[PDB]
Symmetry: C5
Subunit: 214 residues, 5 copies
C-alpha cells in the first residue's frame, strides 16, 4: 500500500546517503603503519588449453578476494538496517593482485562489482581466463603434468600487504566435468620470499595444479 | 515543423526529468527485482574438440520494471516509450557462468523504456563456453549447457524468470555447420551449504549435431 | 589575409558552439536513413565455421532540422567536418554478424547547412555465410541484413539510391571475384506486431578467382 | 640553477596553458592545410596468399603547421619546442585506403610542436592491407600498393606532399623473411565517382620477394 | 589506538594532495631513466614471419625534484604507491616491435621521498628476430633497442646499473634456454643533427632446450 511504497523509497534514499557518506564525503591504500591482509581463494573451473608448442596453459577460475577497512564501516541502525551493498569495483580501492608468470593479459569474465558489508569487509570475486608459463609434458600420463603460478601484489611488499588463505585446498566443486583435462590435485599456498636486493619480505599465494588428459 | 520541435522537446524533458533529476541504486532485499530472460539462438559457429569450447551467437532479451522509470504519457505529449543508451540506466549484471572468453557484444548498447517503467534490452552476443562436442558427428548429437544469472545479487535481490522454456529458434541460421535438435531455457533455484540465500539462474541447454 | 583565416575559424567555432550547445527519431518525428555499400574485398571464406569476412564502406545519410543553419549568419560556412561522437548517429547494425565489426576509418562525419549528414564508416565484418560452391562456375551466394537495432519503420525508414552495390573499388586481385552484389530495401512484419520493420539486404554472389 | 629549472617548468606549463586552455576546428576551404608525409619501411612481416593480405611495419612521419600553435620564445624563457600528447592537439586523419584490419599503433602518441607552429608526429604502425603476393617466391617478386590520405577532407581542405618519392629503407630489417626490391611513395590526385571533389593520397608501392 | 592509523592515512592523503597540485623533461630540465630487464620467458619463435615473443619485467627509474618531501613533515612517510596515470612516465619504446606491447602488470608506481620513482611494467613483446640456428649448439641471436620515442639525449639520458640482464626469474621449463642476455647503453650520433640519441640494446642468445 502507500506505506509499502514509501518503505521502498526510503530504502533507496538510505542507500544513496550511505554511499554518499562513505565515498564522496571521505582510501589511499595500505601502508607500513596500516598494513592490510587480503584473503585469497581460488575456484578452478576449467583447464581449457595446454599448449606444448609454447609451454603455456590456459585456466578459467574465480579468484575470491577479501579485505576489511575501518573506513568502510557503518552502523546499520543509522541507515535503515542496511547491512551490505553492491558497488562498482571502481568506487573503492581494490588490491593489485597479479599473476607473476602470465604470458598474456588476464581476461576478465565477470562484472567489476564488489560487495561491501557494514563491518567494513569487502568481497570481490573476479572470474578470469589466464595464460601462464607451464610445461604440459606428461599430461598424457597417469601422474599427469604439474604446473604452478604465484599470485600477489605487484607493488606492495610484505610491509604493506600480507596475504592469507582460509584453506590450502583449491575449490574444485565447480570444475567442468567434461574438460579435456581432469584435476588430480590443486592447492593454494601462501609463501614468504626474501630477495637479496631488498630488505622487504615479499608474499604470494602459489597455485599448484596437477592434471592429466581425461 | 513546430509540432515535431514540440515532440522533440517533450522527449528531452521526459529524459531529463527521469535521469538528470529524480537515484535508483540497483535492487536490494527491501526493493527486489525480477528480470525476465529469453534467448534467440542464431548460430553455433564453432565447436572445438581440442579445448572443449563451443561458440554461440544469440540475442539475449532482458526485461525488468522500475517504479523510478514510470511516467504519465499525458504530461509528456502522449509519449509512451523511448530508446536510450543503456549507459543512461541501471542494467542487470547477467553473466554466463561457464564462459571461457569475455563475451563479445554484436549490437548497439541501447534499451527501450516504456511508460509503465518497464525496460527491454536485447544485447546480441558471441559467447565461447565450456562444452564437450563429443557425439556431434552422430545421429544423437552432442548436448551442452550454460547457466546465466547475476554475478553479485542473490535471489533475495534479483529473481529470474522466462516467458517460455523453449529457446527462440526462428532466427537460427539455416546453413550453419550445426543443426539444432533442441534448445531449452529453464529457471533453476539452488541452495548452497555456505549460504542461506537462494541462488537463481537460467540454464540454456542445447542439443546439436553436424549438418 | 590571415586576419580572414582567423575570422573563418571563429565563425566555424561559433557555429559548432551554437549547434551543439537531439533525442533520436520518434513516431512523431521520424527519420529516413539512406544506406549504400561500396564493396572493397571478400577477404576470407571459412568453410569450417561458415563465416565470410567482407571489407566495405557503408554510406549513411540523414537530415535533421536541428542541424540546420543559415550560412549568411556564420560567415557563409556551408558545411563542416566533425567527430561522429559530436552528433547523433543511427544504430545501423548487421543482423547476422558473428564478431564485432572492426572499424577501419576515422569516425568523422560531414554536416551541411541544410541539416544533412553524411557519414562513411569503413568496416571489416564477419557474418554467417556458407561458402559451398565458391570453387564452382556458379559460385556461392550469401546475404546479410542491415538495419536499426531498436527503431521500427515508424521511427526510422531506410532507403537506398540504387539496388546495385558499388563494385568500382573492388580489389582486382582478391581471392574472390564478384559475380553480383545487390542491396535491397525490405519491409518485414512480425506476427505479434502491426508495425513494419525495415532492413537493407546485402546479397553477394562470388567465386574463387581463377570455361 | 635549480631556480632556473623551476622557471623552465613554469614557463612550459604556462605556454601549454596559453596554447591549449586559453586559446582550431581543423582545415577548411578558406584555411586549407598541407600535410607532408614520409614512410620509413621497417619490415614486411607476413604475406598471406590464402587471403591476399600482407602485413607491414613502418614509421609514418607527418608534418604540418598552424598559425594557432605559434609563440614567441622570448615570452616563454626561450622555449623553442615541446613534446605533448597527440590528444592535446588537432591531428590529420591520414588513413590507409585498403586496410583489412584496424591499424595497430606501436609507438607513444606524442608529437613535437615548434615555436613557428610546426608539428611533427611519427606514428609507428603495423598494417594489414589488400595485396596478392603471387610471384613473391620468384626473382621478379610481388608488387603491391596502398594509398594513404585523409578519410574525410578533400584536396580543397587537405593537400599532401612528400619530400622524396623514395621510401626510407635505411631501417629495413636485414633478416626479414622478405627483401625489398623497391619502395616508392607518390602523391596522387584521386577522383572517386562517388564524390565531385578529389582526395589527395600518397601511394606506397612496394616490390618484394622471399629472401 | 586506531587514531594512529587514522593519522597515518590523513598524513598520506595530505602528502598526495600537496604533491599533485610537471610537463616532462626538457633540455633545460633533463632527466635520467635507468632501465633494467628481468627476462622471464621466450614464449614463441616464429620462423615463418621472423617474430619472437618475449615476456619480461622492465624496471624504470627516474627522479624528480618536484616529487621530493621531508618525511618529518608528513608523519615519517618515506614512500607511497600511486597510479602511473597520476604521474609523468617516460615514453620508453621498443624500436623493432611488430605488435603493440601487451601489459601484464598493474599500472602503479612507487614514489620515494627523495623524488625517485620506480615503475616496473611486465610486458609481452613480439619483435623482429630470425630464429635460424636455434636448434644448434650455438643457438640464435636477436636484439631489440629500447629508448624514448620523442626525446633526445639532451632531454632524457638512459642508463643501466649492469649490462647483465637479470635471468634469476627465467622460466626453468621454457621451450628455449638462454645462453646469454645483455642490456647495453648505446649512443648514436648523426651528421645532420647535433643531438645524441640513446638506447638500451637488449641482446638475447638462445637455443632449443
Ligand atoms: C493524448 O491522448 C489522449 C488519450 O487518448 C487524448 O485524449 C482523448 O482525446 C480524444 C479526441 O479529442 C477524446 O475523444 C473524444 O471523446 C469524447 C467523449 O469523451 C468523454 O468520454 C471519454 C470516454 O468515457 C473520456 O475519456 C473523456 O474524458 C470524456 O469524458 C467524444 O464525444 C468525442 O467525439 C467527438 O469528436 C470526434 C473528433 O475528436 C468526432 O470524430 C466525433 O464524431 C465526435 O463529434 C471524441 O471521440 C478522448 O475523450 C480523450 N481521451 C481521454 C482519455 O481523455 C489526447 O487528445 C491526446 N493528445 C494530447 C495532445 O494530449
Ligand atoms: C613493482 O614490481 C615488483 O615488485 C615485481 C618484482 O620486482 C622486480 O622484479 C624488480 C626488478 C628490478 C628492480 C626491483 C624489482 C618482484 C616481485 C615479483 C613480481 C613483483 N614482485 C612483488
Ligand atoms: C568520407 O569518406 C570518403 O570520402 C571515403 C570514400 O568515400 C566513398 O567511398 C563514398 C561512397 C558513397 C558516397 C560518398 C562517399 C572516397 C575516398 C576513398 C576513401 C574515403 N575517401 C577519401
Ligand atoms: C556571403 O556571400 C554573399 C554573396 O553576395 C554576400 O552578399 C554576403 O555578404 C556573404 N555573407 C558574409 C556573412 O560574408
Amino acid at each position: 500500500d502507500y506505506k509499502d511504497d514509501d518503505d521502498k523509497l526510503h530504502s533507496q534514499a538510505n542507500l544513496m546517503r550511505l554511499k554518499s557518506d562513505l565515498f564522496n564525503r571521505s582510501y589511499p591504500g595500505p601502508t607500513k603503519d596500516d598494513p592490510l591482509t587480503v584473503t585469497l581463494g581460488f575456484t578452478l573451473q576449467d583447464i581449457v588449453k595446454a599448449d606444448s608448442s609454447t609451454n603455456e596453459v590456459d585456466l578459467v577460475y574465480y579468484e575470491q578476494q577479501r579485505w576489511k577497512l575501518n573506513s568502510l564501516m557503518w552502523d546499520p541502525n543509522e541507515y535503515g538496517n542496511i547491512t551490505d551493498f553492491r558497488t562498482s569495483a571502481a568506487d573503492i580501492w581494490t588490491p593489485d593482485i597479479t599473476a607473476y608468470s602470465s604470458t598474456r593479459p588476464v581476461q576478465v569474465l565477470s562484472p567489476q562489482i564488489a560487495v561491501v558489508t557494514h563491518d567494513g569487509s569487502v568481497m570481490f570475486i573476479p572470474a578470469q581466463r589466464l595464460s601462464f608459463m607451464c610445461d604440459p609434458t606428461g599430461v598424457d600420463s597417469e601422474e599427469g603434468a604439474t604446473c604452478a603460478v604465484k599470485f600477489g601484489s605487484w607493488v606492495y611488499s610484505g610491509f604493506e600487504i600480507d596475504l592469507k588463505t582460509d584453506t590450502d585446498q583449491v575449490d574444485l566443486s565447480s570444475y567442468y566435468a567434461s574438460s579435456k583435462y581432469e584435476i588430480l590435485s590443486a592447492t593454494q599456498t601462501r609463501q614468504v620470499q626474501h630477495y637479496s636486493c631488498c630488505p622487504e619480505p615479499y608474499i604470494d599465494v602459489n597455485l599448484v595444479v596437477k592434471f592429466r588428459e581425461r
